Each structure stands twice: as structure tokens, then as C-alpha cells.
């Protein structure tokens, strides 16, 4: 359970708090895990299309 | 039930379908005769499931009715919080 | 009742932050901090303050 | 071997939970039925055991 | 998720005793569960002359 | 008990409240009518707890009275010390 919630400890540690950009949830520009252009085949419960 | 009269499949068929123990679907068929078919199937759907809901009435003599199920109004909620019975008990009333 | 105060704090703090405070930048390696970049560098003078 | 260190190393019982649920040859069909007695949003099956 | 959402009526980071860097340490320090405790204890020594 | 007369909620209500295991709150409410509310709430719990303390009443044919639990005078203390009972036994007297 909590080392992929220590993976919560391992995809918001090694970057960054101080400066962000252009209004999409967060700091969204992002990259390939965390912003506002990944919804999907996601066809289970409810949030993303 | 009467008169329609009895599902032999055939494509009549009749919406309920008020049986228990359809040792009937097969049974024989054997096979379906010369009609168009498509629904057909619907008639078996709705009324077979009715044949389920009305097949009950009972089994409620040992339930254990339904519950508040959750935390939500529950039109008072202002003098006690709400919590739901997830039914780990063996619901029998013995 | 310690609840309305928290709500008020949340509402005020939603826009209290037009930029980001310089005091969670505890992360930089020695050299990132050291380079004459860092705006907090000119405020790190006495090791006991 | 350079991203995870002491997010640490392993042993018999949980990647136990690993070798015999993703390799060889032995699977089902009617809890197939029961998985669509399962599939995703809330539902009132939220009440029994 | 940026700054510890600590209400101003309970003390701020720059006026408190336990500040951001030690929290950074405990959430990013990475050895063990004994060495971590002893290191943290080593943290709590005054810098008064 | 009478006449006040019986908790319907409403906001009358009354302080005792001498019922047990009430499936009354939920129950219908349904919901509270057009009156002010505030306490209500305090008067509710203040009686509910009493109606459980008074609900005990019996169950005391199985106790096993209470004790000093900890150690303290005990106005004698001059020819024997004092100790308490860590209430870990099953009080049933059967």
C-alpha cells in the first residue's frame, strides 16, 4: 500500500514549488504523468472525458 | 397466465411468463418454427424477470429488510450522523 | 468554533498567493543555492538567523 | 538499479503475492457473471456480504 | 499541496520552532527507521551559543 | 410521560424520553416541521443518555458492583492499604 503511496513519495518529490504556468489544473504545462490532457480509454468509474 | 396460453417458443410468446422451473427452454425446442423473430427475445426478457420478482413475494420471512445503507439524508441528520449497514451478518432471523 | 476560521483562511489564501514564497526552496543542492542566482542568497548571512 | 535504493529490496511473501497470480495456465468463467454483478459506479450492492 | 497550509493564527513558518527544512528532511530523508529517528533527535539540538 | 405527549419531532419535544432501542428517529421524520430549532439538540442527547442509563436499571442482577478502581482513602487506611480492580473480569455472577 504505501510505497506506491510512497510512490506518492516518488512522483511529487523530485521537482518543484515556486513557479507555474497557463491554467490547466496544475502547473499544466506538465509532461507525462500529472496535468489536464490525459483521459482516455478510461472506461471504469467517473471524472475525465 | 390464461389465455395466451403457454410459452412453447414459438414466437408469440407472452410477456409474463409466470413460471418457476422452466425445464422448458430445453427441454425440447425443437427448434423454433417459421416466424420472423428479433423480439421474440424482449418478451422473454421482461416477463421472465417479472417471473422472478413475483416468484418471490417470500424469502422475506427471514430477511432482515433493507437498510439506511449509507451516510446521507435521511431527512433529519441534525441530531445524529448517518452510517450504513454493510451486511456481514448472516441475514436469517433464524 | 475553529471551523469558520479555517474556512475564512482558505478563502483568503486562495488568492493570497500571487507567487510563491521563497522558504520551501530547502531543496536546492549546495551549488544551486550558491549560484548568484538565488534571491534568498543575499538573505542568508548569519548561520544562527 | 539507480532510481530505487532503499525504497528497498526483497524476499519471499509479497512477490510471493507475485509468482503464481501473473505466470502459467489455470483460469475461470462465471464470477465472470459476478464481475458484471460488479462493474464500477457506486452501486447498492454497496450493502451485503 | 505547495506550502503547509498552516493557519496564520497558529504561527507561521518563519516564526515557529519546527520549520520547513526539518519537515523536508523527515519526508525526504532516507535510511531506515532507527537511523532516521536518531538523526531526527540529532536535529533537535539548540544553536544557542 | 403524559401529557406532553410523545416525541414526534416536531420541536416540542420533552426531556424524558424513557424509551429504549428506538427505531423511531429512523424511522420517519419526515422531515422536521416549520419551527426554529437549536436545542432541540442538547435536550435530545441530555435525555437520550439518561434513557440508556435508566435503560440499564436491570442488568444489575448480574453485577458485581463497582469498586474503587484506583487506590485512595477509604477513611480507614490505618490498618490496611488500598488497591483497586482493573475491570478485566466478566461481571455476570450467573
Topology:
The structure is cut from a larger assembly and holds four copies of chain A (49 residues) and two copies of chain B (94 residues).
Chain A: no helix or strand
Chain B: H1 41-56
PDB class: virus
Keywords: VZV, capsid structure, virus
Entry title: P-hexon capsomer of the VZV C-Capsid
Question: What are its keywords?
Answer:
part of a larger assembly, 6 chains, A: 49 residues, little secondary structure, 0% strand, B: 94 residues, mainly alpha, 1 helix, elongated, Major capsid protein (chain C)
Describe the structure.
The structure is cut from a larger assembly and holds 4 copies of chain A (49 residues) and 2 copies of chain B (94 residues). Chain A has 49 residues and is mostly loops. In chain A, 0% of the residues lie in helices and 0% in strands. Chain A has no helix or strand. Chain B is an all-alpha fold and 94 residues long. Chain B contains 1 helix and no strands. Chain B is elongated. The two termini of chain B are 35 Å apart. In chain B, 2% of the residues are buried. The chains are: A little secondary structure (49), B mainly alpha (94). Chains in contact: A-C, A-D, A-E, B-D, B-F, C-E, D-E.
Précis, in short:
Chain E: Belongs to the herpesviridae major capsid protein family. This is part of a larger assembly, with four copies of chain A (49 residues) and two copies of chain B (94 residues). Chain A has 49 residues and is mostly loops.
Intertermini distance of chain A: 28 Å
Structural class of chain A: little secondary structure
Number of helices of chain A: 0
Strand content of chain A: under 5%
Helix and strand composition category of chain B? mainly alpha
Ends apart, CA distance between termini of chain B: 35 Å
Number of strands of chain A: 0
Largest sheet of chain B: none
Helix content estimate of chain B: 10-25%
Quick one: overall form of chain B?
elongated
| Amount of beta strand of chain B | under 5%
| Rg of chain A (CA only) | 13 Å
What is the radius of gyration of chain B? 21 Å
Topology of chain B as a string of helices (H) and strands (E): H
Which assembly state applies to the chains in this document? part of a larger assembly
Number of helical regions of chain B: 1
Number of strands of chain B: 0
Helix content of chain A: under 10%
**Cα shape of chain A:** flat
- Using CB atoms under 8 Å apart, which protein chain pair has the greatest interface? C-E, 14 and 13 residues
Protein name (chain D): Major capsid protein
Family (chain D): Belongs to the herpesviridae major capsid protein family.
Subcellular location (chain D): Virion; Host nucleus
Subunit structure (chains B, F): Interacts with the major capsid protein/MCP.
